[PDB]
Design a protein around this ligand. Sequence first.
Ligand SMILES: Nc1ncnc2c1ncn2[C@@H]1O[C@H](COP(=O)(O)OP(=O)(O)OP(=O)(O)O)[C@@H](O)[C@H]1O
Ligand SMILES: Nc1ncnc2c1ncn2[C@@H]1O[C@H](COP(=O)(O)OP(=O)(O)OP(=O)(O)O)[C@@H](O)[C@H]1O
Ligand SMILES: Nc1ncnc2c1ncn2[C@@H]1O[C@H](COP(=O)(O)OP(=O)(O)OP(=O)(O)O)[C@@H](O)[C@H]1O
Lengths: 338, 366
Amino acid sequence: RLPKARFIAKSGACNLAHKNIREQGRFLQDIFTTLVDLKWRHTLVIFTMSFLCSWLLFAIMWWLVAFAHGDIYAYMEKGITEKSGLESAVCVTNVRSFTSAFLFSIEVQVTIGFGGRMMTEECPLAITVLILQNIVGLIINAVMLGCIFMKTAQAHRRAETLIFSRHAVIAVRNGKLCFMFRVGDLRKSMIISASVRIQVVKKTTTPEGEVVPIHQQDIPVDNPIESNNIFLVAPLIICHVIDKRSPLYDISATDLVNQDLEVIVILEGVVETTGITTQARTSYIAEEIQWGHRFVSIVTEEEGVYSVDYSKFGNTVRVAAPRCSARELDEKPSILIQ
Amino acid sequence: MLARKSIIPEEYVLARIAAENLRKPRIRDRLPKARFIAKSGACNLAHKNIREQGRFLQDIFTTLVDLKWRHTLVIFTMSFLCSWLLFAIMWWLVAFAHGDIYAYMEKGITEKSGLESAVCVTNVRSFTSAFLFSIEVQVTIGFGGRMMTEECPLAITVLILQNIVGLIINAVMLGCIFMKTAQAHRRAETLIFSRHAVIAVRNGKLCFMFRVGDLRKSMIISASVRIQVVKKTTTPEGEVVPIHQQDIPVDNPIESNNIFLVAPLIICHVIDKRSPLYDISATDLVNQDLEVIVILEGVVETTGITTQARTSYIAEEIQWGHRFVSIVTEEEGVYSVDYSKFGNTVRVAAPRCSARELDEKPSILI
Ligand SMILES: Nc1ncnc2c1ncn2[C@@H]1O[C@H](COP(=O)(O)OP(=O)(O)OP(=O)(O)O)[C@@H](O)[C@H]1O
Ligand SMILES: Nc1ncnc2c1ncn2[C@@H]1O[C@H](COP(=O)(O)OP(=O)(O)OP(=O)(O)O)[C@@H](O)[C@H]1O
Ligand SMILES: Nc1ncnc2c1ncn2[C@@H]1O[C@H](COP(=O)(O)OP(=O)(O)OP(=O)(O)O)[C@@H](O)[C@H]1O
């Protein structure tokens, strides 16, 4: 039926729905930012279209400025008269058609300037138009150059690359139940200063009466040294041991599948090749937690080097796990201990 | 040609030293060795049978940005030459079709005409001229003895197409050059490690020590030291953890994992109960399947890039009973260190028992 709520999905990307946020209006800086945040298939198109539109716009202006002076009349009557009676008076030499104005604009801005179409020193309006057009062309070229530099810089990153298991396990390890999951890497480099944090999502209350709605917490990931940095070259099985103080201690075994909990995993680090800090997220819910199972080993010795095979990443076989809550194993040994 | 037609000689006699020498072992171990990471970085694992994700052209561009400086110039030059040539051929075909080549040849064979009033693209007469006109249009030179009259609109289309593509080429190549010039400090990493490891006696318990130093005149900031032991174990309930990496404390005055790296240092590691080195003895520590990894992290203030340096130790290289010679020495007016005494180790009084028992038998004597 209607889906029961999750906090963050099976592919990260927190599903929260902020609503009625007090928003301000438009900051055109946001539009420019969209300009730099683009796809190449569209960046190339707008890049070309800017130049095409600019040339056409200044071509129409150039035709008008060739219209104002006595230019078109002179070049239309010279053909009839076949007389060189218009040698020097014209405003922009040999500009006599909208096509010719368009060609002159192309010549002037990309700095081609073939030089058969000279620009005299007479019509001040024309000199104003030339100054304006040259400045606009310089600005446009600089902006697009900046766009290309940002594109090249943001080329290297492709997509998130740290991979978490289909589901997790809850095994028995060293005389106390432990929550385990599997994390792997697909990169060529390795993640510097990697860190892993685990959280328990549960709707909670406080004994004195306050109400906490989607409260977070944190569960102590274990190392023999009480520290959280982890080095990831082989696929790893992150583990967390159940103590009396984690909220993952009073749950039962059979009745986990019908129980309101969520386990969020956050893995951060800094990539060595390009030096960009990254954070990858995932979550496990009640429906996708297989109690009492355990992961099979995947690293073996191939007589030349160690060898692992991620094709067998998510397979998980069931082995022994006592049918009691992780509390019953310590409050009353005779209840569980055997 | 048919070397061994006469096949008759078979099983007459061989009867020889092939393995029945009896004074030489028949076996040939051949001594192959596998370590978790090579002695000089380059983690050597074996990923295979991974569900592949195909390829995408953005990866080709990503390769374009990451090239050695002796290939960027080559791809630059090839790109420029190919572009000029391609548009030269387009211009040559345009000149051919519109009847310009014939007009120029016929009216220049006899100079009587001098007619250039009806031509598609003036003063293009050969492929040489077309491959000099395309030069004058792409690089924004514009020599201008060859105007483009306004008539033939196909030529104008070609000019628009070529100018825009030329700008694209110029912008992309400038971007590549700038990106490679900005990230030009980033040569490589030059962290120097001692190779041999001692287990001396100091401060009432054993140790685990080596030496590390830099070469760049910039010291490394927020340097952190991590030491791990690689071994295969199983749960008491019996599950194969294939290559368990166990973290072990590196001692320090306040138990924190930063180190300040200016003069080379000893990196101690006191063996205590939790440490996996509790159970290793003198004659034992030549035979063992263990690999101790060391991970050094920091940033270099000059380039502003985070760096991670890796090395690996095996039980075979580690030589019990030694320590490191005091490389430093107060000189005439200023301290100094001779890195030439890097791998040099000396021997001194070394107990031969295990730290497992160096508290069990409570006599500092062994
Ligand atoms: N919805 C919101 N959007 C943006 N900023 C907010 C929002 N709510 C609170 N803030 C920030 O918190 C502070 C709230 O102070 P303020 O005195 O405006 O509270 P308030 O608006 O009276 O609260 P309420 O409207 O809920 O009664 C402000 O500085 C504001 O920047
Ligand atoms: N060998 C592999 N090669 C490439 N990607 C992998 C590999 N193993 C796992 N992944 C990635 O890790 C994620 C988790 O895979 P997992 O094995 O946990 O799920 P799964 O049930 O095997 O998924 P599927 O049913 O699609 O095979 C997947 O989305 C997948 O993209
Ligand atoms: N003066 C030095 N310059 C550069 N590297 C050094 C120097 N001294 C030692 N090393 C490093 O120490 C590591 C061990 O090398 P090796 O065992 O061949 O020499 P060593 O005994 O440590 O020192 P030496 O060669 O001075 O006797 C090498 O990786 C090497 O790079």
